[PDB]
Design a protein around this ligand. Structure first.
Ligand SMILES: COc1cc(Nc2cncc(-c3ccc(C(N)=O)cc3)n2)cc(OC)c1OC
Length: 888
């Protein structure tokens, strides 16, 4: 149709590639995914239309709320007898005169209560009900739901910073008119044996093409469950890369029924010189998406070897044939049987598991042979029931011995009472045994649901099993809030890559949520779009962005404006850091102004939503304020007028830093972790103010960074311009600048705010291992709030040692009441993150599959164990932190 034609040009624009490339793809799974995922789209659209227009308004403008209405004592204590002074604005008559009405209301007041109060006071000045809604003055944020006013992030932030909440009273039909009508049109494209086999595992290696220049090459193979081998690495006989035709049948020490559903064939082509090196690699799922075992011949286009490849095989790598068909291919032949070998149904598995129970009690009572894995009845002592608890407490990176692993499996039936031990129990299973596995599948079909956070440990590279993964999705479906979903969106988008198939529960959960919450959808899109260049994931994400773009609605137009501006900034910075790179800053600027003033560049970058917070409108550009920065890689400091009619109550101007050349994934994770550390601290009752400024990677080493208003680097303060020098840098200079900025009842707050942000960042940088910190890495705001920029490296010793310049601001002139109070905060902060060690390990663990340099192995994540002192007791760790900290 005409509608469809127009749409695929639009989807194609936002996705980076045209829709018709997906049309021409002939792979059962791809066209099956393309079609099958449309019900999620329908489900999501129908949830939007289910309570039209309110539920549609909620989709586009979801309430931005904290996860709980409970205010920690220090947040509550800020309120005037548990009450908040709030200001309601009303735009009246033709001249759009802004009338304000200040109210003192309960912090837990519903928005509708607050509106009624504003109307009460509106009439009581001169001396309706559900016809109005509340909007945040200066940004596209609405308070459309019955949550208490304080539960909203804008209101809780206002309380904490001691800022006056300015809100605007808006007509419901004024917002409802601004809303478009959904039109999810269904696309054009939408219109045997089993476990019997008594054979061993054998696969033939025919030949390899596209291989040449420089001694002898062999094919190395392996059978894996995630990254754990289910047998021995079987290899082909060495051949020089002139005629690589082995045509030999490789035999493995696994029997066809003992193969788990998540079993993979991990192969590679290696070279020999005492010196072995991998050349090209490739992984295959031993079962397809319909659950059929691989039958016949196959041509696997292999992948280049990523630098720093520890082994000869890459089992953690992406499963499937490289899309670049002009790369080293490797033909294989697989054993044929009666017809088609499909994986047994859960019923067949249940009958075999109930047998692996009735005839296992017929193998312990009616066989003789011992296995320290046989579950014994009435032989579950309280002496070892506390031992299971002792194992369940341990961190995800804590090595579990063979003695402990055997003990756990034997007590599998008890472990249901302690559901948090599931990750330790699953790793205790012999996945190379169909008897143990069948018993486990059944325990998981009935396993009690665990917290979303614990269920995430099960969604990493260590747990490939579909039913283990399915349980984990069900836990996030039932217990994960939309707020916590926004927090872990980075790791959740990442774990998609580990999934064996295009169509899974994780993707359906994530897409549904993305298509039911435009805020979740926004970052979901950008997180996927930022990885389209990566040809390892480009397909999966390309299909996902298609299904998203079809059912996202009129927001696709808003995404296209963002994509167009982002490309013009890339193209501009491309020409600049190529044609004018070694030239002077005055020349680069001369060129920048000349180029930005072009008609096509002007309108692509004016009047669009900011990708950093889509609720922020970016109007006209303040070119007089747009400059190339003095900082490294030459970032582009951009300024935009805020077109909001009440911009003067939030920020008249919006400033974004456009970086082209540096990887921002590391800075993104650090700031996600910082934000999580801050929440842990705030809930726990410690007010360590952190500044997790917005950072978003938008492509291959391109990205955006939120400009922190009224802030300067440590160097900028220490100089006062350049009237001092690196030697002449007097230690008291920092405190003096702060003193001149804040005087009177203002000064005491400033020092407090400094010491607090100081204590938080000391603890944060130490745990995380954020090293190479200096005067151009640390920053301070006008109000004394400290923060850190450019997270160069992490995990690779005191990562941030206390400089005199800071301790002096902490007091005035090492042995002060302020330093004693300070030291305490750091000890208190350290102990709080230690109580959450299991979360941070998992969050980091889910990132190994992301192509990050300083997060490749479980040897990088182990650093968190050393800085948090997990092995030691809580009081023992304090002695460790005390020792590392007591060093000046
Ligand atoms: C770093 O130097 C400067 C910074 C800023 N301002 C701001 C405000 N909020 C944030 C940042 C920031 C954050 C992260 C990263 C990163 N990830 O690289 C880089 C910069 N920068 C202003 C400067 O001169 C006026 C300046 O040059 C001396």
């Amino acid at each position: 149709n005409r509608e469809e034609k127009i749409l695929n040009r639009e989807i194609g624009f936002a996705i980076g590639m045209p829709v018709c490339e997906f049309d021409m793809v002939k792979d059962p799974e791809v066209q099956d995914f393309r079609r099958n995922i449309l019900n999620v789209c329908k489900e999501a659209v129908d949830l939007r239309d289910l309570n039209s227009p309110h539920s549609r308004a909620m989709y586009v403008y979801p309430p931005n709320v904290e996860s709980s209405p409970e205010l920690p004592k220090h947040i509550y204590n800020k309120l005037d007898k548990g009450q908040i002074i709030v200001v309601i604005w009303v735009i009246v008559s033709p001249n759009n005169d802004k009338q304000k009405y200040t109210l003192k209301i309960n912090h837990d007041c519903v928005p509708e209560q607050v509106i009624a109060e504003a109307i009460r006071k509106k009439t009581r000045s001169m001396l309706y009900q559900g016809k109005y809604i509340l909007k945040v003055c200066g940004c596209d944020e609405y308070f459309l739901e019955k949550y208490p006013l304080s539960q909203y992030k804008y209101i809780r932030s206002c309380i904490m910073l001691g800022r006056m909440p300015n809100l605007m009273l808006m007509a419901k039909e004024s917002l409802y008119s601004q809303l478009p009508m959904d039109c999810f049109t269904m696309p054009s494209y939408s219109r045997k044996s089993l476990w019997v086999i008594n054979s061993a595992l054998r696969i033939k290696i025919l030949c390899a093409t596209y291989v040449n220049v420089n001694d002898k090459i062999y094919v190395r193979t392996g059978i894996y469950h995630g990254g754990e081998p289910l047998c021995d690495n079987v290899n082909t006989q060495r051949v020089p890369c002139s005629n690589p035709r082995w045509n030999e049948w490789l035999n493995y020490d696994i029997y066809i029924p003992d193969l788990p559903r998540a079993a993979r064939l991990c192969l590679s082509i290696c070279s020999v010189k005492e010196e072995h090196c991998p050349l090209a690699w490739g992984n295959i799922n031993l079962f397809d998406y319909t659950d059929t075992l691989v039958s016949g011949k196959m041509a696997l286009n292999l992948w280049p070897v990523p630098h720093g490849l520890e082994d000869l095989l890459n089992p953690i790598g992406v499963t499937g044939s490289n899309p670049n068909k002009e790369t080293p291919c490797l033909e294989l032949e697989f054993d044929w049987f009666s017809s088609v070998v499909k994986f047994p149904d859960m019923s067949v598995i249940e009958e075999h598991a109930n047998w692996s129970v009735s005839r296992e009690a017929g193998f312990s009572y009616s066989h003789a042979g011992l296995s320290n894995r046989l579950a014994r009845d009435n032989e579950l002592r309280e002496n070892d029931k506390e031992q299971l608890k002792a194992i369940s407490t341990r961190d995800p990176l804590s090595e579990i011995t063979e003695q402990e692993k055997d003990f756990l499996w034997s007590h599998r039936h008890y472990c249901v009472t302690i559901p948090e031990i599931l990750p330790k129990l699953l790793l205790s299973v012999k996945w190379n045994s169909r008897d143990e596995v069948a018993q486990m599948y059944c325990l998981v079909k009935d396993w009690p649901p665990i917290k979303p956070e614990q269920a995430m440990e099960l969604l990493d590279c260590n747990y490939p099993d579909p039913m283990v993964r399915g349980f984990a999705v069900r836990c996030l479906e039932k217990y994960l809030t939309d707020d916590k979903l926004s927090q872990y969106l980075i790791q959740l988008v990442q774990v998609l890559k580990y999934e064996q198939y295009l169509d899974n529960l994780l993707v359906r959960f994530l897409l549904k949520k993305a298509l039911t919450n435009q805020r979740i959808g926004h970052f979901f899109f950008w997180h996927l779009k930022s990885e389209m260049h990566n040809k390892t994931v480009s397909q999966r994400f390309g299909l996902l962005l298609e299904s998203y773009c079809r059912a996202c609605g009129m927001y696709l137009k808003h995404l296209n404006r963002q994509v167009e501006a982002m490309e013009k900034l890339i193209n501009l910075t491309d020409i600049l850091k190529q044609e004018k790179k070694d030239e002077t800053q005055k020349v680069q600027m001369k060129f920048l102004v000349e180029q930005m003033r072009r008609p096509d560049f002007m309108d692509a970058l004016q009047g669009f939503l900011s990708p950093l917070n889509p609720a922020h409108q970016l109007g006209n550009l303040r070119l007089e304020e747009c400059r190339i920065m003095s900082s490294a890689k030459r970032p582009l400091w951009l300024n935009w007028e805020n077109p909001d009619i009440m911009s003067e109550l939030l920020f008249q101007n919006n400033e974004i830093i456009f970086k082209n050349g540096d990887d921002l994934r590391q800075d993104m994770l650090t700031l996600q972790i910082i934000r999580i550390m801050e929440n842990i601290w705030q809930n726990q009752g410690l007010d360590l103010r952190m500044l997790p400024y917005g950072c978003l990677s938008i492509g291959d080493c391109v990205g955006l960074i939120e400009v922190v208003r009224n802030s300067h680097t440590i160097m900028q303060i220490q100089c006062k311009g350049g009237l001092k020098g690196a030697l002449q840098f007097n230690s008291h200079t920092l405190h003096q600048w702060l003193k001149d900025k804040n005087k009177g009842e203002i000064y005491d707050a400033a020092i407090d705010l400094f010491t607090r942000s100081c204590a938080g960042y000391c603890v944060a940088t130490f745990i995380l291992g954020i090293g190479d910190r200096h005067n151009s890495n640390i920053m301070v705001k006008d109000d004394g709030q400290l923060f850190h920029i450019d997270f160069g490296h992490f995990l690779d010793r005191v990562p941030f040692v206390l400089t005199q310049d800071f301790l002096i601001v902490i007091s005035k002139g090492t042995k002060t009441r302020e330093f004693e109070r300070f030291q305490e905060m750091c000890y208190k902060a350290y102990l709080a993150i230690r109580q959450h060690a299991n979360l941070f390990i998992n969050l980091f663990s889910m990132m190994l599959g992301s192509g990050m340099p300083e997060l490749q192995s479980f040897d990088d994540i182990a650093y968190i164990r050393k800085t948090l002192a997990l092995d030691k007791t809580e009081q023992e760790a304090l002695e460790y932190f005390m020792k590392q900290m007591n060093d000046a």
